[PDB]
Amino acid sequence: AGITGTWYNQLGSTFIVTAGADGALTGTYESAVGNAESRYVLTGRYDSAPATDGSGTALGWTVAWKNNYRNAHSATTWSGQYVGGAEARINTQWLLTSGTTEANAWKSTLVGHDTFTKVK
Amino acid sequence: AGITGTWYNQLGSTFIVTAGADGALTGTYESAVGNAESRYVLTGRYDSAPATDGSGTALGWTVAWKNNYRNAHSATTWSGQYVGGAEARINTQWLLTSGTTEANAWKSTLVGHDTFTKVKP
Amino acid sequence: AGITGTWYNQLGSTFIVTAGADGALTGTYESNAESRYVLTGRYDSAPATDGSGTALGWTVAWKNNYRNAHSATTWSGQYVGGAEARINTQWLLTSGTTEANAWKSTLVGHDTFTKVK
Amino acid sequence: GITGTWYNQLGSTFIVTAGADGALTGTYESAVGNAESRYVLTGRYDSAPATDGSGTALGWTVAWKNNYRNAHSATTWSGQYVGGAEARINTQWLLTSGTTEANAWKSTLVGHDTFTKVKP
Numbered sequence: 404a405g406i407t408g409t410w411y412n413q414l415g416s417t418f419i420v421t422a423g424a425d426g427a428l429t430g431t432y433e434s435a436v437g438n439a440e441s442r443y444v445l446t447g448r449y450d451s452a453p454a455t456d457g458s459g460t461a462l463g464w465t466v467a468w469k470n471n472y473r474n475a476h477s478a479t480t481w482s483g484q485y486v487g488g489a490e491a492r493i494n495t496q497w498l499l500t501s502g503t504t505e506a507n508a509w510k511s512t513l514v515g516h517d518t519f520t521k522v523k
Numbered sequence: 524a525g526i527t528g529t530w531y532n533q534l535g536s537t538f539i540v541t542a543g544a545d546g547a548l549t550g551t552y553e554s555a556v557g558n559a560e561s562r563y564v565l566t567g568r569y570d571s572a573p574a575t576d577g578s579g580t581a582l583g584w585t586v587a588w589k590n591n592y593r594n595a596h597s598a599t600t601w602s603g604q605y606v607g608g609a610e611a612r613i614n615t616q617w618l619l620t621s622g623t624t625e626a627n628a629w630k631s632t633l634v635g636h637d638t639f640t641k642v643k644p
Numbered sequence: 645a646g647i648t649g650t651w652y653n654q655l656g657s658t659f660i661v662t663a664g665a666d667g668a669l670t671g672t673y674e675s676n677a678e679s680r681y682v683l684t685g686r687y688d689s690a691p692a693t694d695g696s697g698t699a700l701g702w703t704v705a706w707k708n709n710y711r712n713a714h715s716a717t718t719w720s721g722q723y724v725g726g727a728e729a730r731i732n733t734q735w736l737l738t739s740g741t742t743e744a745n746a747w748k749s750t751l752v753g754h755d756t757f758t759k760v761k
Numbered sequence: 762g763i764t765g766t767w768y769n770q771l772g773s774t775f776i777v778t779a780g781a782d783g784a785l786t787g788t789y790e791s792a793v794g795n796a797e798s799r800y801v802l803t804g805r806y807d808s809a810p811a812t813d814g815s816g817t818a819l820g821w822t823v824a825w826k827n828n829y830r831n832a833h834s835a836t837t838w839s840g841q842y843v844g845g846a847e848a849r850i851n852t853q854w855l856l857t858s859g860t861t862e863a864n865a866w867k868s869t870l871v872g873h874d875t876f877t878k879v880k881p
């Protein structure tokens with residue numbers, strides 16, 4: 404699959420993931436520093452039988468921003484595809500939703516994009 | 524009362540979820556739209572200790588659209604919040620990314636919004 | 645075309661628009677003069693006649709003669725005619741930020757507009 | 762500033778004028794999709810940005826109809842202009858097609874484009 408291992412995005416975030424045989428993604432998401440207060444559980448899913456025509460491998464995962472040290476009352480989902488090779492990449496778009504009151508729900512969700520590589 | 528239960532979106536998709544004490548979401552999703560049949564595995568995360576100021580509970584989950592019957596070579600993530608009440612609701616926005624070639628990657632990702640209720644609309 | 649006129653979203657905003665013969669959208673977006681802003685956009689002036697909606701989009705930059713939020717919203721969507729006509733949209737709201745804060749510069753959401761408030 | 766000729770990462774050409782009243786006007790030539798030749802664009806920008814180093818917020822729309830083709834669709838780009846040595850406009854976009862109600866769930870694509878003064 405090529406997905407299991409450590410990945411790094413353009414802002415230094417570190418994505419430590421295992422791609423299980425039946426489509427599970429499990430691991431930890433942390434900052435470049437890696438201190439415990441910066442580490443969070445992640446879980447997701449990937450296509451464990453991708454096409455063989457040169458297409459990428461679809462995947463997604465979620466981090467809720469709560470750990471044993473802090474709680475930002477929010478969660479991010481990344482949706483994207485893995486592209487293999489010597490310059491392997493995971494190319495994603497993400498949504499970060501915070502818990503809000505109904506009056507503030509219109510501004511609950513940020514959108515962005517992250518690219519991950521196997522090299523810092 | 525809470526996130527654990529059976530939910531339906533505005534199109535009649537069925538979201539059967541369990542919210543574990545450790546912040547885990549697990550369960551199955553059945554889509555009313557697209558190249559999909561029967562149940563698919565989902566996993567995700569939710570805030571197990573939400574704020575006490577009237578705010579909703581943040582959460583997210585992923586389905587990869589492969590099961591024993593079909594494989595669409597794609598995955599959806601839903602990002603949103605649970606809002607308690609007499610008509611409990613989960614309001615989400617979603618991203619659906621297909622595996623593509625690089626030349627087709629610009630059109631790889633659909634976006635939308637789904638609202639879920641424990642009463643089927 | 646059915647687009648020209650006054651529209652109301654789900655949260656009390658008012659969208660006043662003219663759909664010109666050349667594909668232009670022009671008008672004002674509100675929420676009193678302190679809360680009114682120019683909008684401009686484009687729509688498909690020759691949509692299909694097969695039950696499909698009419699694609700369109702517009703932008704508001706949140707500056708007027710009284711206030712300036714240093715931000716701008718774009719709405720992308722389609723007009724759906726009939727007895728209960730609608731403009732169904734998704735939107736992106738980008739703020740001007742420093743580079744260090746750019747990762748959190750953009751909100752996303754959805755607005756539904758009706759011809760009755 | 763914003764007025765000039767810009768190119769996205771895929772080679773699309775964005776020829777824009779930023780007027781004194783906050784107006785964006787010009788033409789767009791897409792490098793992808795059911796598109797050919799130039800299309801009209803209109804939009805808006807913040808004509809009095811902050812003076813603290815922040816970017817200038819802006820947005821614009823293209824409806825994909827011209828004298829040669831009609832894709833029955835429209836794209837909006839929302840983003841900010843970042844001045845300096847190599848000026849850049851960083852955007853996210855939404856591309857909605859006209860659909861029936863039963864197909865509306867798949868009506869909207871999302872992505873991100875970055876524009877510079879140099880061809881990629």
Ligand SMILES: COC(=O)c1cc(C(=O)OC)cc(-c2cc3c(=O)[nH]ccc3o2)c1
Pocket residue numbers: 416433434440441442468475477479497499517
């Ligand atoms: C409310 O968000 C938070 O509390 C929070 C906290 C941390 C943290 O503790 O860094 C150690 C990191 C992020 C974060 C978000 C994010 C994102 O959305 N796309 C790309 C990566 C990424 O990292 C968010």
Ligand SMILES: COC(=O)c1cc(C(=O)OC)cc(-c2cc3c(=O)[nH]ccc3o2)c1
Pocket residue numbers: 657675679706713714715717735737739753755
């Ligand atoms: C007080 O200034 C305003 O009127 C104002 C200010 C902001 C702001 O502070 O963004 C920095 C945002 C909006 C706004 C409205 C709106 C809408 O109706 N649908 C979609 C998004 C959206 O954003 C309006």
